[PDB]
């Protein structure tokens, strides 16, 4: 006859929210079918669904969302899927890889690859993605899957755990008319099985209005009408209004609240033929998953596959460093030991630390461009904050921060002719690696939690300029006054320029035919590399060389702890 | 005002399209991928005329000589300014579009006529509004756009989608004014996208276009009756506006295109079918509007004086006390290199001078507001003068009496003129690239990668004399090099850095370099007074070269 006997209802009685008050008296039940929450954008159309699930703060509402006469159970995260309005699924991965990534984190670890492969192929067969799963999704740069199946594959990541009460946030925004009915036929097909498809459409059509089972109208937190969708036009026809011939039924309800206002329609539905039945049923009915290794493996795997398939930012960063080091070694080719050798040595050493410190602005776009995905998967039951922070860090700050540092010193070293030593080559390589790591770690301590990329970049270029002045070349570090010399310890390029300067100006002379390593007659000459280090404020002991390394290592852990605390205390609602 | 076009064959998007336009209220419909938006641009003089293959005549006579002076065109974006009130921006278009014969006694009467016919009497004493200031919302933002194009009494009006991004609360309100103004004889031709039944009941002439093919043309009352006999039937409680779009999309264009040529609405269609001012007035009005937009923005003008005042106070606080010793040369060349570097890198914020108002320049150039030379001279007079000369004149009057460079009357003006010419040439170089582009992402990275290249050739990171011969010629194509060499020549001159060692006549023990001249020769700078002014004539030649490139890029643009 049919296909199901009962469904998981979701009843609510007196829903009041305040942030100040955004919802007043909202009540009604949601029978298992395909119900919709209509209304304008200024009301609680897109805000009722956030309180219907677990998307808002518990200290803001005062009602109660009962599920079959019982409150929200503990398996609700695994029995309800929320579909985000904007894009969520990555474009650098295919449909099978996107479904397998969420299937490996949402399902339990007791399931092998046999049940997970047939579960993914089952969702693919119901989603109609047999020929799409074998292709990449695509983004603004590569083409693969158009927008007709982007919303289909976005909901496929939620049907992995076989939910009962599926939630959607405007599933028709960003589509046309053919794809709206294509995506709605699948929702009606899944609704006929036994799912409670609740969403909030925005200005639909008659071909989509006829498919709704229930309908709730909201306008500025006031319940205007709640009942079947077929009886919505008949209720307003005897209340004082009447729709015209050849008119959209959904547009007539939105035209009534606008002026064919909000104080007379709220006092109409409270004493009608649809409020006493709902109040009679409402008072009757009302009176992590995986381990840390599996999360750190699948998160770093998806981030590494995303970084490998993005040639516009990974390979371009290597070409911009290869052509930079080639033109640097070509200009400084021939570092002689004369009067001009000190200016060439200090300029080539200062430019390497300034370029490594100013190239960390590109690393800011790491947590800000994927903020909606982190706040969506974290409150859904995917991983924790430490697993996401370590998975994105092990896949982005390691192969893109250490690669331009090693290729930048293996070319200009044998090309310039700094110090022909085996240990000196590895010292400046490790110094540039610690400089780029500390600058990117400082970049992550500012952009964590924010969304606007213009403020994190304006504040970073401002503090990078202030740290660039205190490096040791534009101004001497010993002539600064006492109430300002303490600011030299709060920089980044200074530790790199100090360790880079100590590694070269050592047993090198700078005056031809004037041995001044034991006797320097006529002062004010600087005829050795040691006189330049003391003239700038550098210690000649070997401890002074490793002091900047132990200072940059401490600044790395401090900035990473601040970035982790900023991601832990973030508002996930 | 009976517009009529023949078979328009547009391609690079159109095929066969013909039909008269009744002087009443015409509406163009169709999908976004069709030729709905391209019909309004090809119906007037806003598209490529060489890619046309049809004939457009206006009541017998074709396009007259004053079609731009008797026809209006609006856009769904912005043609108005937010920092200016609705009474002065409307008068700005009234001073450029009208002749000088119209006195002020009759000019304000026409302005009050639009402020009384449109319905903006209470808004005449308020501004429009941007992202910071508050004026009006989106309801009044569309009234001043049509009001700007409603200066003279026209005959044919064009409107590119006058409902996109407009709520349904005032959608019928902004559409009723079009039918109210259409009763006098305004051939209002708009391209509405996805209407409703409340907008579909007042249409006087409908024109459905899809994939460059004409689907239906005639009255709107007979639109639903034509498709009833073609093989379709509308359902109850359904909007007939978007219903015609579902038939085209497929609940296709190869069977609905020829079905209209053999109907009754097509046989009856082919029956009847077969500058002002001067250069000074445009420069004064453009510079006045751009100057008013400058003083009206407290986020783009006053913020730059604070970003240069704190920088000038922290520089004078760090370098306070430039003593003459062994370390005096490093502090002097470092503070002098930072002035030309900050002044050259501050030109990145001036790249948003021509790329933001690009739609305003193309839309004002097509209607016949001014010319391409008056907009350039009017913009470089009220933008590159009070914002490019103020931070250079205040960055030198603070650090000169705080650092202690050369206490001379003439060297203070040399340092001020050097920083002014450096900032003028850096902003002129960024203007030769942003002029002509609409994207700000590519124009903001090329200036950083180019300025970082000129930063190496300045004369501090690498000695200029030690560069090989096949690469030393690259130092001439820089900007901070001329400013740094002029500031070094102006500062290092009669200075002595050796304490208790008079080396002006006798300098025993060489390899010392402790005079103001032993450092200039070692850096590559001449001691003659001509060597000081050589960088000034080089920056002056590069200013005129980059400004000529920016003007040629603004002139040779696809303004269609």
């Amino acid at each position, epitope marked *: 006859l049919k296909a199901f006997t009962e469904g998981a209802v979701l009843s609510f009685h007196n829903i009041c929210y305040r942030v100040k008050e955004i919802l007043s008296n909202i009540n009604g039940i949601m029978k298992p079918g395909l119900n919709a929450i209509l209304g304008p954008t200024g009301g609680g159309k897109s805000s009722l669904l956030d309180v219907l699930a677990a998307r808002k703060d518990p200290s803001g509402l005062s009602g109660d969302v009962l599920i079959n006469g019982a409150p929200r159970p503990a398996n609700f995260k695994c029995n309800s899927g929320y579909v985000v309005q904007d894009d969520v699924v990555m474009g650098t991965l295919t449909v099978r890889e996107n479904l397998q990534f969420s299937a490996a984190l949402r399902l339990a670890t007791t399931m092998t690859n046999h049940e997970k492969n047939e579960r993914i192929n089952r969702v693919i067969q119901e989603l109609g993605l047999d020929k799409v799963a074998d292709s990449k999704v695509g983004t603004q740069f590569i083409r693969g899957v158009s927008g007709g199946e982007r919303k289909r594959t976005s909901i496929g990541m939620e049907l992995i755990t076989d939910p009962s009460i599926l939630f959607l946030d405007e599933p028709t925004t960003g589509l046309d008319s053919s794809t709206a009915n294509a995506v709605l036929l699948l929702l009606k097909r899944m609704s006929k099985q036994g799912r409670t498809i609740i969403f909030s459409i925005h200005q639909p059509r008659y071909s989509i209005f006829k498919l709704f089972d229930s309908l709730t109208l909201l306008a500025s937190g006031r319940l205007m009408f709640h009942g079947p969708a077929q009886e919505a036009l008949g209720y307003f026809e005897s209340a004082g209004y009447h729709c015209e011939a050849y008119n959209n039924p959904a547009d007539f309800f939105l035209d009534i609240i606008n002026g064919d206002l909000i104080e007379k329609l709220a006092e109409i539905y409270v004493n009608s033929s649809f409020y006493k039945e709902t109040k009679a049923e409402l008072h009757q009915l009302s009176g992590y998953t995986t381990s840390f290794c599996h999360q750190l493996r699948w998160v770093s795997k998806r981030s590494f596959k995303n970084l490998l398939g993005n040639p516009q930012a990974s390979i371009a960063q290597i070409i911009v460093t290869v052509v930079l080091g080639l033109v640097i070694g070509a200009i400084y080719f021939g570092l002689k030991n004369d009067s001009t050798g000190i200016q060439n040595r200090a300029g080539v050493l200062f430019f390497l630390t300034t370029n490594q410190c100013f190239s960390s602005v590109s690393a800011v776009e790491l947590f800000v461009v994927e903020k909606k995905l982190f706040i969506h998967e974290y409150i859904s039951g995917y991983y924790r904050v430490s697993s996401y922070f370590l998975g994105k860090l092990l896949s982005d700050l390691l192969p893109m921060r250490m690669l331009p540092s090693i290729i930048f010193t293996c070319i200009v070293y044998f090309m310039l002719g700094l110090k022909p030593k085996a240990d000196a080559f590895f010292v400046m390589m490790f110094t540039l690696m610690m400089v780029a790591y500390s600058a990117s770690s400082m970049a992550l301590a500012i952009a964590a939690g924010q969304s606007v990329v213009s403020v994190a970049t304006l504040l970073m270029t401002i503090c990078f300029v202030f740290m660039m002045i205190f490096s040791g070349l534009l101004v001497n570090l010993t002539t600064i006054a006492s109430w300002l010399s303490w600011l030299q310890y709060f920089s980044i390029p200074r530790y790199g320029f100090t360790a880079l300067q100590h590694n070269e100006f050592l047993g090198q002379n700078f005056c031809p035919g004037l041995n001044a390593t034991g006797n320097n*007659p006529c002062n004010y000459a600087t005829c050795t590399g040691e006189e330049y280090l003391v003239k700038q404020g550098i210690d000649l002991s070997p401890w002074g060389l490793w002091k900047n390394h132990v200072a940059l290592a401490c600044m790395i852990v401090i900035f990473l702890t601040i970035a982790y605390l900023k991601l832990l205390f973030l508002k996930k609602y | 005002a009976v517009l009529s076009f023949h078979n328009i064959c547009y391609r690079v998007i159109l095929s066969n399209i013909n039909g008269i336009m009744k002087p009443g209220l015409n509406a163009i419909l169709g999908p976004t991928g069709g030729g709905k938006s391209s019909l309004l641009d090809v119906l007037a003089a806003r598209k490529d005329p060489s890619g046309l293959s049809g004939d457009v005549l206006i009541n017998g006579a074709p396009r007259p000589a004053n079609f731009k002076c008797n026809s209006g065109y609006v856009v769904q974006d912005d043609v108005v300014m937010g920092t200016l009130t609705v009474r002065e921006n409307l008068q700005f278009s009234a001073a450029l579009r009208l002749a000088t014969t119209m006195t002020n006694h009759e000019k304000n009467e026409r302005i009050n006529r639009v402020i009384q016919e449109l319905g903006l009497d209470k808004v005449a004493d308020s501004k429009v509004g941007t992202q910071f200031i508050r004026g009006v919302s989106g309801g009044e933002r569309k009234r001043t756009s049509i009001g700007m194009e409603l200066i003279t009494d026209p005959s044919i009006l064009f409107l590119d989608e006058p409902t996109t991004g407009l709520d349904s609360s005032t959608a019928n309100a902004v559409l009723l004014l079009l039918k109210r103004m259409s009763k006098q004889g305004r051939t209002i031709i708009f391209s509405i996208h996805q209407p409703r039944y409340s907008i579909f009941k007042l249409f006087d002439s409908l024109t459905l276009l899809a994939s460059g093919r004409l689907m239906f043309h005639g009255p709107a009352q007979e639109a639903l009756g034509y498709f009833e006999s073609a093989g379709y039937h509308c359902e109850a409680y359904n909007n007939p506006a978007d219903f015609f779009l579902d038939i085209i999309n497929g609940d296709l264009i190869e069977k609905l295109a020829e079905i209209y040529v053999n109907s009754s609405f097509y046989k009856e269609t082919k029956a009847e079918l077969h500058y002002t001012t001067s250069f000074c007035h445009q420069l004064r009005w453009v510079s006045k509007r751009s100057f008013k937009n400058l003083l009206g923005n407290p986020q783009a003008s006053i913020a730059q004086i604070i970003v240069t005042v704190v920088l000038g106070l922290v520089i004078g606080a760090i370098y306070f006390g430039l003593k003459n010793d062994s370390t005096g040369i490093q502090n002097r060349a470092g503070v002098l290199f930072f002035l030309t570097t900050n002044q050259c890198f501050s030109s990145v914020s001036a790249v948003e001078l021509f790329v933001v108002e690009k739609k305003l320049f193309i839309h004002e150039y097509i209607s016949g507001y001014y010319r391409v030379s008056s907009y350039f001279l009017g913009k470089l007079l009220s933008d590159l003068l009070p914002m490019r000369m103020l931070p250079s004149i205040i960055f030198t009057c603070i650090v000169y009496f705080m650092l202690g460079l050369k206490p001379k009357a003439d060297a203070f003006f040399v340092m001020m003129f050097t920083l002014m010419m450096v900032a003028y040439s850096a902003s002129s170089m960024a203007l030769a690239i942003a002029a002509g582009q609409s994207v700000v992402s590519v124009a903001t990275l090329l200036m950083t990668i180019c300025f970082v290249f000129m930063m190496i050739f300045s004369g501090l990171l690498v000695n200029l004399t030690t560069i090989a011969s096949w690469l030393s010629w690259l130092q001439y194509f820089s900007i901070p090099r001329y400013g740094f060499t002029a500031l070094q020549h102006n500062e290092f001159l009669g200075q002595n850095f050796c304490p208790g060692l008079n080396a002006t006549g006798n300098n025993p023990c060489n390899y010392a370099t402790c005079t103001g001249e032993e450092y200039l020769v070692k850096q590559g700078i001449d001691l003659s007074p001509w060597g000081l002014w050589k960088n000034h004539v080089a920056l002056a030649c590069m200013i005129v070269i980059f400004l000529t490139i920016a003007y040629l890029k603004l002139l040779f643009l696809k303004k269609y």
Partner: antibody
Amino acid sequence: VQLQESGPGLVKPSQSLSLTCTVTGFSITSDYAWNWIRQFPGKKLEWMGYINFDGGTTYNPSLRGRISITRDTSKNQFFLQLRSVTPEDTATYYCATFYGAKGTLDYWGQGTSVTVSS
Amino acid sequence: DIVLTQSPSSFSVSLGDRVTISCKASGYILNRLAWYQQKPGNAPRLLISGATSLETGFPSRFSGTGSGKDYTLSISSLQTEDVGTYYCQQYWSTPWTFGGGTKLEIR
């Protein structure tokens, strides 16, 4: 080459002190600079400040606004104003020279014992 | 600043002995220390300039070595015409500071 220290030796506290060291056999603005060294009543020395041949005067940070070296080209003399004198500044003042390139103070002065008492 | 310390404030040598006077410092001097010799009743005459060479008018018995942060003045065959107080002055930076004083005393 040859210097000669002269001035008062009994100054009241909380007042001013002025010394004068003439230079014979060399110019005062030729090449060498001139300092002011005091030997405390005991076995200690302190460098007060110096004046370059052109007019550059670098003082000691210990004397905050108390030392003022002033020169004269005609008589080839350089003085030393010490305002707000204290009883602990009863040191014997000398006037040494300073060749920039060797760097050391070669020629010195005889020195004058300055007593600060009431 | 760069302070100059001297551990032996008073010596007790004899006649014809190797007098070892040492003077360390706080900062790096790099062979910029000068030695002085003040007689009981005169002006401090310059002895060793640069802590390496030796001025004229003095015998070759005065020799100054040491490099880095400490400098040592050696006297070979000390007689009775070498008594007095010795000092160690630096001239690396601008606040030139002297040393203590090693007053020699014969027995």
